Symmetry: C7
Subunit: 248 residues, 7 copies
Amino acid sequence: AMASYDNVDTLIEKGRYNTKYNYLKRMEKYYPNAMAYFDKVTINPQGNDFYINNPKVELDGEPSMNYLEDVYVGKALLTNDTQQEQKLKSQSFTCKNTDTVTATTTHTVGTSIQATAKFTVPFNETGVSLTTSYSFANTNTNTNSKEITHNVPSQDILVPANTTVEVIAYLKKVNVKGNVKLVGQVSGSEWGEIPSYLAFPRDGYKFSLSDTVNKSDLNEDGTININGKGNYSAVMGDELIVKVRNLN
Amino acid sequence: AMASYDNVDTLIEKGRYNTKYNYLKRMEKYYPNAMAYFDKVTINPQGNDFYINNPKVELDGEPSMNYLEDVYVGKALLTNDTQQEQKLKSQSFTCKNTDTVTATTTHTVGTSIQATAKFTVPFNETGVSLTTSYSFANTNTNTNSKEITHNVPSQDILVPANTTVEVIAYLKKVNVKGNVKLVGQVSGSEWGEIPSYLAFPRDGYKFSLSDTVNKSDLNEDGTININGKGNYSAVMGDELIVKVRNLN
Amino acid sequence: AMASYDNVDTLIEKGRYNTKYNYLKRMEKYYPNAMAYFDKVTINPQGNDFYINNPKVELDGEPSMNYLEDVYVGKALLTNDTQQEQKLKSQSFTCKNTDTVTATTTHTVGTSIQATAKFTVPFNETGVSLTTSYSFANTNTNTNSKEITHNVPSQDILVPANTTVEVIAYLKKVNVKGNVKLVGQVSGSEWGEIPSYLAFPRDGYKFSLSDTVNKSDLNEDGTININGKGNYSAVMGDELIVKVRNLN
Amino acid sequence: AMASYDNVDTLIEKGRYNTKYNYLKRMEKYYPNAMAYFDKVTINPQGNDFYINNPKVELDGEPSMNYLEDVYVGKALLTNDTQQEQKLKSQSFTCKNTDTVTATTTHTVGTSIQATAKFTVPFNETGVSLTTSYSFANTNTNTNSKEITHNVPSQDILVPANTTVEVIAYLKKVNVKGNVKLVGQVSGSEWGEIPSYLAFPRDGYKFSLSDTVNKSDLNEDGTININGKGNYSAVMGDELIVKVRNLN
Amino acid sequence: AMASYDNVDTLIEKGRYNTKYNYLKRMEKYYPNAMAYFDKVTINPQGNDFYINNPKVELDGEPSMNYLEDVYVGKALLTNDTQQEQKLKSQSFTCKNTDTVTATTTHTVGTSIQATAKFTVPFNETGVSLTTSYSFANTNTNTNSKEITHNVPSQDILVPANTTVEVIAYLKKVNVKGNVKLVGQVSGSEWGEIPSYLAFPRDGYKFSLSDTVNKSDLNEDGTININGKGNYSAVMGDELIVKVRNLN
Amino acid sequence: AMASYDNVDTLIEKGRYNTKYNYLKRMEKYYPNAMAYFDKVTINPQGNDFYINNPKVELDGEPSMNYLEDVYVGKALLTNDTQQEQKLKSQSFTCKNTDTVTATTTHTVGTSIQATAKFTVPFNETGVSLTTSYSFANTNTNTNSKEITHNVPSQDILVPANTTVEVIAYLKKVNVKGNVKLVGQVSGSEWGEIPSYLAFPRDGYKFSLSDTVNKSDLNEDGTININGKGNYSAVMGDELIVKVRNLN
Amino acid sequence: AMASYDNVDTLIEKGRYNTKYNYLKRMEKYYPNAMAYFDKVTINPQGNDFYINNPKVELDGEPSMNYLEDVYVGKALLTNDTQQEQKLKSQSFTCKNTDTVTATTTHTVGTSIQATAKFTVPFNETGVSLTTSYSFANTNTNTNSKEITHNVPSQDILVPANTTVEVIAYLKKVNVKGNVKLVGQVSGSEWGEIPSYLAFPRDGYKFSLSDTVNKSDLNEDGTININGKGNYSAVMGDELIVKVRNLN
C-alpha cells in the first residue's frame, strides 16, 4: 500500500533463506543428524520469473571499471587541401569472437552378402567371390555458436579548408560493476531445486515474492512496491577513448 | 451489428471449451465410464487462421519487464579539440546466437569382385588376389538455423568545441509481458486435434469464431466485432539505457 | 475495345473450367464411364506467363491481419545531459531463419592388389602379404538455402537538452490477406497438365487469355482490358509498433 | 554514313539466317538429300561480342509485369508523443536464396604390409599378425554459389508531434518484359556452332555485323548505325508498394 | 627530355618484338633451321613492374558497351498521404556469385595388432581374436574463393504531400571497352619467358622500358615521358537505368 | 584519505614482490637450500579483478608508433561535370583475418554378425556369408574463431561544379605504445599461482590492493586513491593517412 | 641533441651491415677460410620493434602507380521526371578474394573383439562370428583465412528536375610505390638471426638503434631524432575514376 522495498534482491535472498529454513525443517522425520547444518546446501535457482510492473530503471553513479586488455589503437591523419570545408572519415575496425559447440550422432545399419566360390580346376584354389553391400547412416547434428563483435566506428570530422585533424581511437575491453536504481511493482515466483547433500534428499522448492514480505505490504494486485537500486556487477564491456585534434 | 467483444481469447477459449464439451459428449456411445472427466484432456491447437479485418492495434500500458541478465556496458569518452563543433561516434556491439539443427541420411550400395588365385609353385601358397570395388552414396541433408542479433548502436554526439561527452550504453536481456489494445473484425476457424487420452480416442476438431458467439452478434460478412485489449506475455526482449553526459 | 474485366482470376478460373470441360469431353472415345465426373480432377497449373501491359497496381483497404506470434519487445531509455539537443539511437535486432536442403551423390571405383606369400620355413605359417589400393571418388553436391530476416531498426530520437525519451518497439509475425486494385492489359497463355485420375489419362492442356473471353472484348493487340481488384491472401509479414515518448 | 537500323536483333537474326543458308548450301557435296531442310537445325550462339560505341540507352514504355507470387507485407505503426517532430523508422526485411553446386574428386593410393605368424605351440593356432597401412588422398573441389537478395528497406517517416503514421510495404516477385530504346554504333562478330543434325555435320560458323548489312551502310570505322528499341523480355524482378499514411 | 610517347603499349610491344628478335638471333649456334620462323613463338609476360611516376589518368570517350544479359528490373510505387513531404525508399537487390577452389591432401599412417587364438576345445574351432588399431591422418587444405556482388541500391525519393512516385531500376551485365588517357613517367622492366617451341629451347627474357626507346628520350631519372591514351578492353561491368517519375 | 598513488602497477608489482617474499619465506621448513633464490620464480597472474571506482581515464601524449607493414594505398579521381556542386565518394576496402581453432572427439561403437555357411555340394567350397553391421558415432566439436577487420572507409567529397578532387588513403598496420592518465579508487584482489620450481612446490597466492599499501592510505570503503598515468604498450593498431586535394 | 637523421632505413641497414661485419669477424677462431666472404650471407630480420615517439608522418609526392588489371566499369543513367530536384543513386559493386589455409590432425585408437565359432553339425562349416568394435578419433584443426574486399560505392547525385546524369565508375587494381616523410624519435632493437652458410654457423644477432649511431647523436632518453622521408614501395592498391556528367 504505502510501504516499499529497496531491492528485488533483499526479497529473493530472503525467500531463499526461507526455503533453506523450511527444507532443513523438513529433515526432522528421518535424518535430523544434520539439522543445524545450515551451510554448504547450495540452494540454486532454476526458474526466476518475477515481473517489474511499470518499471522506471535509470542508472546512477559512474560504472566501476575493471580493465582487462587493450584491443586497438588507431590513428588517422585527415588532410584537406580543397579550398572548402570537407568532412573526412577515419578508419573502422571490428573484432569478432565466435565459439561454436556441436554434437552429432550417427546410426549406421549395414548389410553385406558374399558369394565366394572356388573352382580349383585351372590351378590351385583360384576362387572368385562377389560381395554386395548396403548401408544406411542417419545423423542428427545440432550446433550452437555465440558471436560477439566490438566495432570501433569511423568518425567523420569537419576538417577546415587547408588543415588536418588527427583522430585517435583507443578501444579497451573491460567488465564493469556499477549501480542502477529502479522503481516498480514486483510479483512472481521462483522455482528452483535444493541439491541433495550427500546425506540429504533433493527437493524442488518454489516460493513467490508475496509470501516473502509482510502481508499488507503488497498492493491490491499482489505486487509489492520496490524503490531502491540494483547492482549489475561483472558485465563484459568496452571503453572507447576518441581524441580528435586539429593540428596546423 | 452493435455488440462487440473484448478479446479474441474470450472467443478462442470459449470455442475450445465448446469443443471439449462436444467431444466428451461424443463418448456416450461406447466409453461413458470417463464422462464427467472434464480435465487432463489437453485440447491443443494446430491451425489457427482468424483474420482481424481493419485492425487498429496500439499498445497501452508500460511493458512489465522480467530481467534475465546483463549483456554489455560500454563507456566512451569523446574529446573534441578542433575549435569547431564536431560530431563524434561511440563504439558499437553486436551479440549473435545461432542454433543449427541438421538431419542427413546416406544410402550406400557397394559391390566388390575378388579374383584370388594361389600358385603354390614358387614356394608355399604365394597367391595373388585382385579385387575391384564400386559404391554409390546418396545423402540428403536439410538443416535449419535460427540466428538472433542484439545490436547496440553507435551514438553520434554533438560534442562542442573544446570539451568531452561521456556515453554509457547498458544493454540487458529481458522478456516482457505487457498489454495491447486492438479493434477490428475477427473471422475464421481453428482446426486442431483432441489427443487420445489413454482410454479415449483422437479426434480432429475444427470450430469457427462465428458459432462460438451469439448469432446476430456478427456483422453481415460473418465477422464479429472486437474492441478490447490482448496480452502478449513472455516475449523475448532487450532494454538499452543510454546516458550521454557532457563533462568539463 | 471498350469492355473490361474485374480480375485476372475471373479469366484464369474460367479458362481452367473450360479446360476441365474439354478434357472431360475428350473421354467420349473409350472411357465415358466417368463422364459427368466433373470433380476431383485437380487441374493444376504449371506455366503461367500472363503479362499485364501498362499496369497501375495500388493497394486499397487495410490489410487483414492474422497474428502468429510475438518476436521481440525492446525498450530503450535515452537520457541527454549535454546542454544541447542531441539525437540518440535505440538498439537494433535481427532474426534470421535459414533452411538448407542438400543432395550429394558419390561414385567410388576402388582397386586392390594383394600379394600374400607364406614361408612356413622359420616357424608355422609366417606369411607376409603386401597389398596396394587405389580408389576414385567423384561427388556432386548441389544445396539450396533460403534465408529470411526480420530486422527491427534503431530509431534516432531528437531528445531535448536535459530529458529522456522512451522508445518501445514491438515486432510481431503475421500473415496478411488484403486486397489490391490494378488496371492494365493482360495477355498470354497458361500451360499446365491434367493429372491422370486413377481411371483417366494425363494430358498437358494449354489455354490463353484470349480464347477465354468474348472476341472483340480484346484490344487490337490481343490484350484484354482489366480494371478491378486482386486478392493477395496468406502472405507472410510483420507488424512493428513503435511508441517514442518523452518522459520528464 | 546516313542510313541506320532499328535493332541489333534485326542484324543478329539476319546474320544467323545467312549462316543457316550458307551451311545448308555447303551440303551440296555429299549429303544433298536433306537440302531444302531449312528447319530443326538450331543454330545456337556461343561467342557474341558486338560493341555499341557511344551508346545512349534509355527505357521507354512502362514495363509489362508478370506477377509470380507475394513475398512480404509489413505494416508498421509509428507513434510520436514527444512534443516535437521526430523521424521514426519501420522494420526491414531481406529474403536470400542461395544455390550452390559442387564437384570434388578424390584420388587415394593406399599401401599395407601384414606380417602374420602362427605359433601353434601354446595352444591351437594362436597367431599374432601386425599390419601397417599408409594412404594418400588428394581431393580437388570447386564449388559455385549464386545468392540473390530482395531487401525491403526501412522507411524513415517524419511523424508530427503527437500523431502516428502507418506504413505498408508490399513486396512481390515478378518478371518483366518491357522495351528499351538505344542508339549507337554496333560492330563485331559472333562465333557459334551449327550442331550436327543426325544426318549432318557440326560446323563452327562466325559472322560479323558488317557483312550482314549493305556495304556503305557502315561508317568509316566499320560500325553500322543503330537507332531503334530493343526488348528485354523475361527479366526477374520485384515490385514494392509503399503507402505511408497519417492516421489521427 | 622533351620527347614523349603515346602509350605504354607502344613500348611494351616494341620491347617484346625486340626480345623475339634477340631470341631468334640466339639460334644461329646449333638450330638455325627455324631462323626466319618469326611466328607461333608466343612470348608471354610474367613479371610486369613498370611504374608511372606522377600519373594523371582520366577517362575520355564514352565506354563502348557489350550487353551480356539482364539481371533485374524492379518497380516501386511510393505513395504519400501524410500532409507533408516525406522521403520514401524503394527496394534493394544484390546478386552474389562465388567460385571456390579447394585442394587438400591427407597422409594416413595406420597400425594394427591382431592376437587371434583358437581353442577348438568346446566345439569346432571357436577362436577369439582381439585386434587394436591406431592411425594418424594429417590433412592440409588451402581453398580460394572469389565473390562478386552487383548491388542495386534503394533510392530515397522526395515524394510530395499527397502523390506517388514510380521508380524503375533496370540493372544489366555488360563488359566495356573504352579508352583512357594518361600522362606520366614510366620506368621499369618486364621479366617473362620464351616458351620452348617443339624444336626450340626455353629462355627467360627480361627487358626494361629504357632500352626499348631512343636514348636521350628519357629524363635524368631513367623515366620516359608518356602522354597519350591507353585502352581497357573487355572489363566486366554493369549498367543501371533509374527512372523516377511522379504520377498523379 | 588524502594520499594517492600514481599507478595501479606500482601496487600490483609491489604486491607480487610481497608474494614472492612470503612464498620464499615459507621455505624455511623443509627446503631452505634455495632460500635467497629470489629469481626465476615466475609469479604469474591468474585472477585480476581490481575495480577503479569513479574512473576518469583520458589519454595524454601522442602514441608512439611501431610500423609493421603497409596494407593498402587507394587513389580516387572524382570528376564533376554537372553544373552543380555534387558530393562524390571514393572506394572502400576491408581486410579480414580469421583464425579458427577446432577440437572434436568421436566415439564409435560398432557391432557385426556374420553367418557364413559353405555348401561344398555344387562344386568346391562355394559358401555364402551374410553379415549385418551396426555402429554409433557420437562426436563433440567446439571451435573458436577470432576475426579482425581493418576497414578503410569511403570519403564523400564536396567536389565543386566543374572540377576534380583526388583522394589518397594509405592504411598501415602498426602497434602502439603510448601513455594514459587516470584517476579513481582501486580496490580488489589478485589470485594467481606460484609455479613449482624444479625443487619447490606450487602455491596459489592471493593478495589484495589494501594490504599492499600503507593503512590509512585507503578511503573509508577500502579503496585507495590513484592519480597518475598507466602505460598501454604493444597494442595492435592502424594508421590512415587521407589527403583529399582539388586539382584543376 | 641537435643532429637528426633522414630515415629509419639508413639506421637499420647500417646496423645490419655492422652485424654482418661482427659476425664475419667472429669467424677468426676456427673457420677463417671464408673471411672476406662479405656476401650471400642473407642477414634476415625477425624481431623489429623500433618505436617512433611523437611521430608526424604525412605523405608527399603523388604515388607512383603500377597498373595490374581492370576490375569493373559501371555506367548508370539516372533520370528525374518528378518536377523536383531528387538525389538518385548508382549501383554498387564489391569484389572479395578469400584464401583459406587449414591443417588438421586426427589420432584414432580402435579396438575389436571377434568371437567366431564354427558348428560344422548342420552342414559343412556353417560358423557364426560376432565382432564388436570401439574407436576414438581426436582431431585438432586450426584454419586461417584472409579476405580482401574492393568495394566501389554507390554515388548519390543531385539530378535536377527534368534531366539525367551519367555516372561512370572505373575501378582498377594497382600497387603503388610513393614516398612518405616523417619526423620523430626512434628507439629500440632488432633481433634476427644470421642463417648458417653451408660452411658457417647460425647466430642470433640483436642490435639497437642507439649503438648504430654516433653517441651524443641521441637525446637524453636514448632516442635519436629522425627528420626525412621513408619509402613504401610495392603496396597493393586501387584506383577509382568517377565521372558524373549531366546530359540533356
